[PDB]
Design a protein around this ligand. Structure first.
Ligand SMILES: CC(=O)/N=c1/[nH]c(C)c(-c2ccc(Cl)c(S(=O)(=O)NCCO)c2)s1
Ligand SMILES: CC(=O)/N=c1/[nH]c(C)c(-c2ccc(Cl)c(S(=O)(=O)NCCO)c2)s1
Lengths: 545, 546
């Protein structure tokens, strides 16, 4: 038949979390031998057979080895806690190895979570071998090959190692890190090198933290505190590291860039309540400054997960040839309670309005074109619309709550981005989120409800939503892996978190239905936002008396 | 060939009238000549060439004469004021000749309008032909005499037109009626029969007009006026025509039915200030009784156009097989300020809501089923949903205004329909009309926005819309012929009227987009109507403030 081919298509090439496939799976089995169309199919096949029969397992194992090779994302699904079997786990690891380093890095965070699911005895044995294949051996081998990987891997392990089930995973992660440092210490010249560099980073942060704690103890309003901060950095050999000069250190935030000194005067502290510094650094090359922020008191693991998410979505959209000019900025955590964040030069939307009446005035000031469209250079408008679309959709998919003018920022080229992703998957302090988050001023920024640009924005949202809908599996698989993740919003209900993103993605609906649905959310949110729209609705209510 | 075809196929199918692509028109020519396969192409083809000079015009007629024959609708487009040329009008009329009588019956209003479009010389020649001293007017006459129902309608449309460039058009209309009547008198027996029938009808109408004038005269309250009315009916010789019995006349509002007499005891009178009367008539056969309304206040030319449009749309939908179970009651205007309306048994919603707290109760009273989706039988519920769907869509395209709960009535059966059309094409006494018209109570009748019936209802509107979009052209041509019509609402911005319906049609949108647009309109209308949805909006507005 031909109908048969299509019912199968819905099943192998639609949803990954679905345990849905039920008996149809048995039907899948028959075609399975004749045609394993694709990799997507392999992931689906694996789900149905395993537990019941040893002989059935033998046939499946042979089937998997023969099978057309799976794509990496599916590999993540395999590393998931759902699949117990060692051979499938090994196969999943083989898939990862084949993948290029940069892609391997993007996932890395999940791979560390994945570590929890890999059997403990592999890890105890490996330890046994080092003191008086399996994935953890794989992560260490790969981590050693590449310095940047070594660096993130080290930072992720260390975040886990500091102070019920916490005990089992902590001992195990601790085991992993000790092994990693010991492999580097022995390794050769390049590995020894990696080890020294980390030693340096660790030392630098500790002193940086010490200085920060002194600043907090010292009393004053922010400015008095900041002046004090400037003074400490300039103070030579109060600290183990001298902040005005040091030996070059690959930035922990970015491993690629060494730093030299810090400039005491260029350091500010932020308006936000928990006060984080901007710092500047010089860099090893040509003296170029870098800045990052550094944050005194918060666990950023949540922020890093969301940013990875935004980075990933952006990568996917870009291959599709959609650039929404999203800015994913680097975060890392250090310890829980400190990290860095990349600094983007921007003005907070609230600052822009306070300081320039409206967004347009501010853009116009930076990029005047007499000729169009708002007396603002066309490209800036374009980037602003695109950033807006990218963010509504991503904020919506990732269920990001708690946005405000302090929260959004702008750039001088136009882009908008978000910040401070403390509320995730629809947690909001408030009782009633709008489903889509657009400030009145942002809508006005587009020249109101009826403008060419507003239409461009909605068109753009639908397209972006549709593309993400298509590339579901990867995000769902990364979330599947973040169940026991120690990200607070996920921690409230582990299970519901994966389900929530799936619900937002709206995979059930047909494409025409999904666009209509999205349109509906945008519309309620925008009507609520505009006052003219609200008075007009009152008028319609009134019309029936 | 390959890529040039798609743009061809788009232009023939997609726009109803286009200024655009004048260079495109000249581009089509080269490949127009050759394809010449399908008729809808022909319509677009004629448009370009005539502004273009004369020697190509004669070539185009050979092209025209040969081209695959048009469907009737495209021809109403050619009778347009837009195309002046005489040979095409022959072609258009030959096209009309082909139409079965029922189709001509539908387009009649528009055809009488098409008379306003020249040539006067055609009328005067025919006048000179029957007086002391095929082609359009002749066609209409010859056609009218062929069939009696056709003749009736033709008479009443002519009749109303005759009762600084308007006077000359009036005068022309007058000649056409007198000719039509003289043809009937000189007629073989059947014509004479039709003629005698028309006379009977008028004599009758005028006696009833007098009677109404006498009932209107009294200062006494409405209840006192009904009583007076009944008495005027019960006494014969009061009028040249006696109302308690007369020789069977074919009902003027519906030609087929014959009426013996009005029944006086059953006569009732309506609430509106200008005070309409409801009359029961006796049919000639089997003592069937037919109810009608006769209205003394205003010309129903507006109301009748709308009902034509509704009937038209219904037919299209049902031809795509969408019984949205509309109820297009018949309307005829006798003259400006008197009319007849098919009465259909109905309870106004406002009435239904006082009589019953809710619409569900009402429906439940008339068709219970314990297993029913609600207390109600499933068929009633489905029909109600459909009727709503049809009516929102139609109201939206038509920019019908003034809807209130007295304006829309409900049948025991469940069909919902709107009755009154004072305000049209977005004219509304009120300043900000909802784009879609739903009573809050109508939505509740669907079981609310989460309820599935509501979802089905919405699905129904979208498809109704999609289909109607497809037969865009027939409506457009009709309205283009109604430009000089004398409906008050067209008259204020007569040129702009057609454009207003065209905006409602959103022809520019692709189908997915169209639906989206309509969805937006539904949404606003419903949210305004529901107090819970406004509350939600209210909390949302609260979010950004602080
Ligand atoms: C002027 C300016 O604020 N430039 C910045 N570019 C970026 C990426 C900033 C940033 C990123 C993350 C965080 Cl967590 C912060 S924060 O100011 O430390 N917390 C804000 C809570 O409302 C600030 S701030
Ligand atoms: C109201 C009722 O019970 N049955 C009816 N069925 C029909 C088609 C009605 C109708 C149609 C057109 C008009 Cl114009 C009217 S009307 O009641 O005469 N005009 C309303 C306010 O002045 C009533 S009324």
């Amino acid at each position: 038949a031909s109908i048969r081919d299509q019912l199968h298509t819905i099943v192998y090439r639609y949803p990954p979390t679905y345990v849905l496939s039920s008996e149809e799976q048995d039907l899948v089995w028959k075609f399975r031998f004749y045609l394993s169309s694709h990799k997507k199919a392999l992931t689906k096949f694996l789900k149905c057979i395993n537990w019941k029969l040893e002989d059935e397992v033998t046939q499946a194992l042979w089937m998997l080895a023969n099978w057309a090779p799976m794509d990496v994302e599916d590999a993540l699904e395999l590393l998931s806690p759902t699949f117990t079997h060692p051979q499938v786990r090994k196969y999943a690891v083989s898939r990862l190895a084949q993948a290029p380093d940069e892609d391997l890095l993007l996932y890395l965070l999940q791979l560390v979570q994945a570590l929890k699911y890999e059997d403990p005895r592999h890890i105890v044995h490996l330890h046994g071998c080092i003191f008086p294949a399996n994935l953890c051996t794989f992560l260490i081998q790969r981590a050693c090959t590449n310095a940047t990987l070594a660096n993130y891997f080290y930072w992720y392990l260390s975040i886990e190692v500091e102070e019920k089930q916490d005990e089992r995973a902590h001992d195990m992660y601790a085991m992993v890190l000790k092994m990693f440092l010991k492999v580097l210490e022995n390794g050769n010249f390049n590995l020894r090198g990696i080890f020294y560099n980390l030693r340096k980073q660790r030392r630098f942060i500790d002193e940086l933290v010490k200085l920060v704690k002194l600043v907090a103890k010292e009393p004053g309003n922010r400015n008095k505190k900041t002046e004090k901060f400037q003074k400490l950095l300039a103070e030579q050999d109060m600290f183990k590291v001298n902040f005005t000069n040091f030996e070059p250190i690959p930035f922990p935030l970015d491993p690629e860039i060494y730093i030299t000194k810090i400039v005491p005067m260029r350091t500010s502290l932020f308006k936000s309540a928990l006060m984080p510094a901007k710092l500047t650094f010089v860099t090893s090359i040509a003296h170029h400054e870098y800045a990052a922020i550094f944050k005194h008191g918060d666990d950023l693991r949540q922020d890093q997960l969301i940013l990875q998410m935004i980075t990933l979505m952006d990568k996917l959209l870009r291959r599709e040839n959609l650039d929404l000019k999203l800015t994913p900025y680097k975060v890392l955590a250090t310890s829980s309670k400190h990290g860095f964040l990349q600094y983007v030069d921007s003005c907070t939307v609230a600052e822009v309005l306070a300081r320039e009446g409206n967004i347009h005035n501010f853009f116009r000031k930076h990029h005047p074109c007499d000729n169009g469209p708002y007396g603002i250079s066309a490209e800036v408008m374009d980037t602003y619309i695109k950033s807006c679309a990218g963010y509504c959709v991503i904020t919506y998919l990732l269920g990001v709550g708690d946005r405000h003018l302090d929260n959004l920022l702008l750039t001088t080229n136009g882009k908008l981005f978000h910040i401070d992703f403390g509320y995730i998957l629809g947690r909001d302090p408030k009782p009633m989120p709008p489903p889509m988050k657009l400030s009145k001023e942002m809508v006005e920024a587009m020249g109101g409800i009826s403008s060419e640009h507003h239409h461009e924005f909605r068109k753009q949202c639908y397209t972006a939503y549709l593309h993400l809908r298509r590339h579901a599996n990867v995000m769902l698989n990364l979330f599947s892996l973040m169940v026991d993740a120690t990200v607070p919003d996920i921690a409230l209900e582990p299970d519901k978190a994966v389900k929530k993103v799936e619900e937002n993605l709206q995979l059930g609906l047909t494409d025409e239905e999904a666009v209509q649905h999205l349109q509906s959310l945008l519309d309620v949110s925008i009507t609520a936002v505009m006052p003219a729209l609200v008075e007009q609705i009152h008028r319609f209510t009134q019309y029936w008396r």
